[PDB]
Amino acid sequence: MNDFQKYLSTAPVLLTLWMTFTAGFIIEVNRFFPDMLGLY
Amino acid sequence: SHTVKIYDTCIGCTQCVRACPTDVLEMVPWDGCKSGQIASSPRVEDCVGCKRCETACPTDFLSVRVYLGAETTRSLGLAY
Amino acid sequence: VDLDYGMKNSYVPATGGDGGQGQFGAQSPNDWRVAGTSPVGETSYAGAADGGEEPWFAEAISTVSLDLQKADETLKAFTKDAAAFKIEEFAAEKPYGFTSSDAAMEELVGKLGYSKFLEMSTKQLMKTWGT
Amino acid sequence: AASFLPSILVPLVGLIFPAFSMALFFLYVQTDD
Amino acid sequence: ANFIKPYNDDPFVGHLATPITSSSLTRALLKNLPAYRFGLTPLLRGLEIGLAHGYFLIGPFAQLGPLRNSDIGLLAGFLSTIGLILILTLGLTIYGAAAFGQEKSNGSELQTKKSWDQFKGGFFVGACGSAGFAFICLSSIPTFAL
Amino acid sequence: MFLISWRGYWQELIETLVWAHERTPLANLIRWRDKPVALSIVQARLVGLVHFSVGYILTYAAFVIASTSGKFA
Amino acid sequence: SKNVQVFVEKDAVETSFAKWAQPGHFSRTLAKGPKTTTWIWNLHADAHDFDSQTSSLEEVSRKIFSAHFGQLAIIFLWISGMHFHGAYFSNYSAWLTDPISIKQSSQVVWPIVGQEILNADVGGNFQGIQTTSGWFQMWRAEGITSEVELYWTAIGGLAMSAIMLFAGWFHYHKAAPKLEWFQNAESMMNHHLAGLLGLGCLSWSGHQIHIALPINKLLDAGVSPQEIPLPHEFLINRDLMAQLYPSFSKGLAPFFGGNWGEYSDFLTFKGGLNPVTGGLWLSDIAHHHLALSVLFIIAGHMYRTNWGIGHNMKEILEAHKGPFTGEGHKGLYEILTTSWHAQLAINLAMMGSLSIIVAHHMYAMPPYPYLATDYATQLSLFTHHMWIGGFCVVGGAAHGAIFMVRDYTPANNYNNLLDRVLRHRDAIISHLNWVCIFLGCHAFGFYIHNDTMRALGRPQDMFSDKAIQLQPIFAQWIQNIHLLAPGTTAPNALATTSYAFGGDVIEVGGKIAMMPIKLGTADFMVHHIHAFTIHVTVLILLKGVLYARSSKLIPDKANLGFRFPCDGPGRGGTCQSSSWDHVFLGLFWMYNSISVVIFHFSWKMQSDVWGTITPDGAISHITGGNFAQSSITINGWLRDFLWSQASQVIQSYGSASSAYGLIFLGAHFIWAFSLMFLFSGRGYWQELIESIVWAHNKLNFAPTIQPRALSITQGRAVGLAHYLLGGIGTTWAFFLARAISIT
Amino acid sequence: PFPTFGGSTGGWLRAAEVEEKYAITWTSTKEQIFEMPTGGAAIMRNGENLLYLARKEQCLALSTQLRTFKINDYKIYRIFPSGEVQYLHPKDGVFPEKVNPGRTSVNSRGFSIGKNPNPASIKFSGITTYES
Ligand code: CLA
């Protein structure tokens, strides 16, 4: 477990997870609040 | 042909003279360093300009500097 | 042997940007710019090799070689000064029953050949010449 | 007539002149003063 | 059996004695070519070489040139060949000047200034004349029919 | 070609060509007086930049002229 | 005891996640830790170079076997996904009913951000991206009929993927074979040539004879997919098969007896293409595989194993020596049984060469139902396999060079073929250089000559079919030979192997599937250009292999390695003199070569083959036959091909083909981006980085892993990578967009 | 005393006959196969061996290989067209990597690389900063 957590703490892995999360939240925002070119 | 100069920062590691592909460098007696030896360039007429020597120097800045210059058959490595 | 044969070349060092003639000269005394092949029964590159019935491949006929006997001489001549320095130091360190530099050289080189002599420290030499 | 000049000069400028010039340069760079 | 051996029995020269390089056929052909043949004077060497090269050069120009289909096509081809010969002759002259110099002595050695000049002259005469011969020959072609 | 390919490759190839000329009968008669060698590092850079530049200008020159003239003239 | 035995070590490597948390464990140097950014890049570049990670062949070998299992697992997952996507996100059922109208689609995009436009109205009450891999045609040939079957094959794929992954772990951590096991070439070849290929073909023939053939006959006749009996029904009820093929009634009795003729119903040598589907007759394909199977199985019994009979490859190789080749093939066996790189070289080159052959043979002789009329799929497959082939071929050369620098031993190679080759390398390279110049000057000169002539208003002086003509006489002759073969040199055949050589026009759905392809002056000119491109590629690559260890310029290149940046600024400059650099340059020429080939295919087909034919004999080709008089000049290619056939991509915005337009532009960008890595040097970048780092330091912060510029070699690699991606990507979009429209 | 080699197209050319040539010599205790810089494999003789090359680097490269075979008695010479010979390596009998009393320093500057003069100072002089 400890060792696996270290692998999951490696730079490449963390970047992918973080970017996936970031991408996801951006996509989700556009799904519910779509087509915005300004704050209204 | 090319010009090779050695500076006082040499430490007599002998690495440069062991890397020259054409025996241009030698290790001569000296007292400025603990090793008691310094490098010399007695036969620069056979330098091809490889700069392998510089790559081997351990000093902060190369104690052995090769300045490329006039070119001859020997310096241009022409077997023909 | 003319130790300066190579140094005696047409090369003239430039002011700045040139290492110089170095230790053995920078260029061959002879000029490489010679002619090409010639018809049967003729010669072109001065002291060239006759191509016989195949003048087209005359340049492949070697005329420049190294005599093993002559090789020994060149080794001795070019390393004469080094030998001198070596024996001189041996002489300086109070040699046992020393005679003459040359004599010592012959004795010391009679044994330990010559190459070995050149690569031996004065201390080793004195040990060797203890007798 | 001057009108004939294009057909008398162009052959010279584009063929004869360049040739001789190149030849001279070669002889100049291949000579050892 | 090994058909490839070191050239001149020198294992370190950059050449090999292959069937192509050293066969009776190759040796014979090269020995009797005008360039390397024995006894030919510089002029004659050039002449033979020129006669050979001029005859085959008129063809390309005559059959594939700008005025090939014109009635004066063969004449034009001849002129074109002469032009090419002149260019090649200039080259020979220039080469000699650079390679050999200005004054010579040996003599009768294709590789000297005088000999080279004679060689060049022969080439020009032979080449131009050979081209002319081809013009005469190509003027009327035989069908060799009985 | 000059910008992406560097000297080492070409020098080795030129060496082979020298061998051929010296070993081919008839052509052996003629020889060079200046040893054939590959272009230098900086030289190639210059040659390449010039080729790139000349082509750049020439191609646009044709377009700007033919396009404008062909349509409005 | 037995010459061939199984030797395996139990519990060789412990399974744990410790090493996973220690990046760089494989290397001694990298293991120490990161001090500069170079460490990161090196970690990824030395990951699979096992030879440098260990000094024992056994260990290297063990890793390779397991790694291969991993690739197989990935491949299985890939295939599984495709079948699943064809079961849940496709219009196969509708297409199956009306193959001519409905367009194949197996990918659907989520309705996010207007990307839905990409979901086209393909047909069959379905909206999705039109795929071009040819899955539908293959499935029809197999006799899938349903989408339930596709689901099950998908499940099988997933299962297989898992099995392979387990095998990899098992044969590396629990049961690792020893070196002796690996070094059994004769056995391996016997097994792979009789079991993998022979039994494989036989098994496939079984499926084709018992399941595919019957179902496809019914489909072609007109039977609705739902009305066709399930596959198992055919296998059980022999009577049903007898109705379709009236020989199954006799059973296997004819086979055991010598009367193989009775099976002529399903095993045939018809030749040509099925008129209804436009694909090769399945009956012929069944006989094909059956015949091949027998051949392979017989061939698998040629090498000695443990029973005396057979051949020993070493003996065969050593016996073949002649007067002009010294010791001959002596020493090769040891090389190929003690060097993985050497083996990869040969294997990789042959694999790539096969792909190129597949591309040619798969268009001339369409193998699947309803494939020829689908111009998009045809173009996609040809180009795809042409590329895969080029990369593999260059790769073979690369690994060949790695062998010379790392595994070649002078002692084991005295006066053998390899030694003698390296002893006349100057001659070989010199001659090839000339051949390349000759071909290049003459071949490309033809085009330049024509351009000048047409521009100068002198069309009668061009090398054209209407002026000075350069006809491909030899090829024209072979075509006639192949056309007249059926009934003569091939008496039992009924039609030409391909209609390309000659014959009639096969049309399916009003569209031309195949037609005689004629060869004229333009074809001569282009074919010789192909020769030039290939020859130059070989020059660069071969020079790299031959001069890998030494050269007149750098006599000790071997010690420097296979991938060194240079030797220095001396000797006039020694930049890019490694064998790696030769591969680097070779790839650029391979790109050029393949690009021209694929363009030839695209224009020739759209001009002299593809098109529509009326009920009566009126053939209208897509481009109109412009290839003959337009492909003879460079301006023609720029105008009648690139400029005209690119009207689709540039005008794709606002349509389902908009993606191709965006990718076309993106690829151009990446191609240009690469030119900054290919023209610049590390020095400028390193100095720039220094100034940037100054800023970070001025604000009291800077990375301990000191930022450094990419290595010389990496710079070149990054440049080549982006260059290739951009160039190939651009054509990818260009072709696909154009094809969708033409189809 | 030539080693056993079958020939190659990578040997010497005209320069070796009209400009300059090189030669290496060594002694072996066994007949073994070595790789020659020119390209190919050769078998050395049990005793004295002589080989000709066109470049000094080619000769010194072979010496490196020889050291692997534990041979350290190699000698390199340069033969001019007229027959003159120059002994080049080991020059003083002692390999250059080993300090030998009696060798003088050459091309040495007694200061750090950063103490060289400024280019502008030596303008119109003909000398370079590193030679100044
Ligand atoms: C359009 C760009 C272009 C062109 C024209 C060339 C041209 C060439 N490359 Mg090259 N190359 C390029 C881009 C290009 N390269 C790029 C971008 C790279 C980077 C990867 C390379 C990398 C590269 C390598 C690594 C190699 C080449 C080689 C070659 C040569 C092939 C031999 C040949 O066909 O000679 C013919 C050349 C021609 C240009 C043909 C056209 C010339 C006319 C039509 C023929 C008649 C003209 C006549 C001789 C003189 C006319 C007189 C008058 C015009 C003054 C040739 C000089 C190979 C080589 O040198 O081996 C031989 C080789 O090894 N190239």
Ligand code: CLA
């Ligand atoms: C301004 C320079 C110039 C000029 C005036 C010409 C003129 C000509 N060229 Mg041309 N050419 C040039 C530059 C030039 N070229 C360049 C730079 C190239 C390289 C791309 C070419 C490549 C080229 C080709 C490939 C061909 C021509 C051809 C022709 C001829 C076609 C017309 C005709 O009647 O042919 C019919 C020919 C004749 C009626 C024969 C005319 C008599 C000849 C020209 C006498 C030449 C003798 C001359 C003094 C020798 C030179 C000596 C030297 C010291 C300069 C014409 C004489 C064609 C031709 O037929 O060549 C002759 C041809 O095939 N040219």
Ligand code: CLA
């Ligand atoms: C490299 C390819 C190529 C080829 C084959 C041709 C061919 C031709 N051109 Mg063209 N041209 C080209 C490129 C080419 N062009 C390019 C790139 C340009 C742009 C600069 C031009 C511009 C051009 C012009 C402007 C004109 C031509 C013309 C011609 C024609 C005249 C031929 C001539 O006089 O040659 C003369 C050839 C020779 C003297 C020698 C030929 C080579 C020999 C046969 C080789 C022999 C080798 C031998 C077999 C070795 C073995 C020997 C051993 C057995 C002993 C001919 C059809 C003219 C014409 O009328 O057009 C139709 C013309 O006016 N060309």
Ligand code: CLA
């Ligand atoms: C070659 C394999 C392959 C490929 C390229 C695709 C591609 C696609 N599939 Mg598909 N599929 C495949 C195999 C494949 N499939 C197989 C084998 C099955 C059977 C299980 C399926 C079942 C399937 C379904 C059921 C669906 C798709 C869908 C899709 C599309 C959306 C993909 C997606 O989820 O995006 C979004 C991606 C995600 C939601 C995943 C989140 C991203 C993760 C978290 C990043 C990875 C984390 C990283 C690895 C951490 C490393 C940790 C370390 C231990 C390694 C896409 C075109 C969907 C679709 O088309 O809908 C219309 C859809 O519904 N596929």
Ligand code: CLA
């Ligand atoms: C008849 C026996 C047999 C068969 C079928 C194979 C088949 C294979 N070997 Mg192989 N091998 C054999 C004997 C056999 N070997 C022997 C005796 C040796 C020792 C001398 C080796 C040593 C060996 C090495 C060293 C390597 C292979 C590799 C491979 C694979 C090559 C990649 C490929 O074509 O993918 C085709 C892929 C498939 C067809 C997928 C299915 C694969 C499974 C395992 C087939 C097993 C039979 C299957 C269950 C069908 C049963 C029939 C039943 C339904 C009635 C392939 C799966 C290479 C590899 O990648 O291995 C991982 C490799 O590196 N083999």
Ligand code: CLA
């Ligand atoms: C059967 C296929 C095969 C196999 C098993 C190998 C195996 C090997 N090769 Mg090899 N090679 C192959 C094919 C193959 N190659 C081909 C086809 C080529 C020609 C291009 C090469 C060219 C080649 C070179 C030039 C070198 C090797 C090297 C190596 C060794 C180390 C690999 C390495 O560094 O891993 C690490 C692997 C990687 C870093 C690859 C990662 C993928 C990169 C990032 C490209 C990804 C492109 C991607 C598809 C684009 C996606 C676009 C998207 C983002 C939009 C290893 C023995 C190297 C070596 O030192 O050998 C001893 C070496 O120098 N090979």
Ligand SMILES: CC1=C(/C=C/C(C)=C/C=C/C(C)=C/C=C/C=C(C)/C=C/C=C(C)/C=C/C2=C(C)CCCC2(C)C)C(C)(C)CCC1
């Ligand atoms: C393939 C081959 C071969 C070869 C061939 C050839 C290569 C040929 C050539 C040929 C040739 C190439 C020839 C030529 C000829 C020439 C001539 C025949 C000439 C003549 C001339 C004359 C006769 C004269 C002239 C003149 C002069 C000199 C000057 C003045 C004027 C006049 C006119 C008088 C053979 C068969 C062997 C064999 C096989 C291989």
Ligand SMILES: CC1=C(C/C=C(\C)CCC[C@H](C)CCC[C@H](C)CCCC(C)C)C(=O)c2ccccc2C1=O
């Ligand atoms: C092709 C190529 C060469 C070889 C190119 C050469 C040798 C050019 C040769 C042809 C030019 C046009 C010179 C030919 C000049 C004629 C022989 C006439 C000369 C007359 C004199 C009087 C000037 C390099 O040397 C090189 C070096 C470094 C990086 C890339 C490359 C590179 O790509």
Ligand code: SF4
């Ligand atoms: S540049 Fe090369 S030849 Fe000159 S001294 Fe340094 S290592 Fe020796």
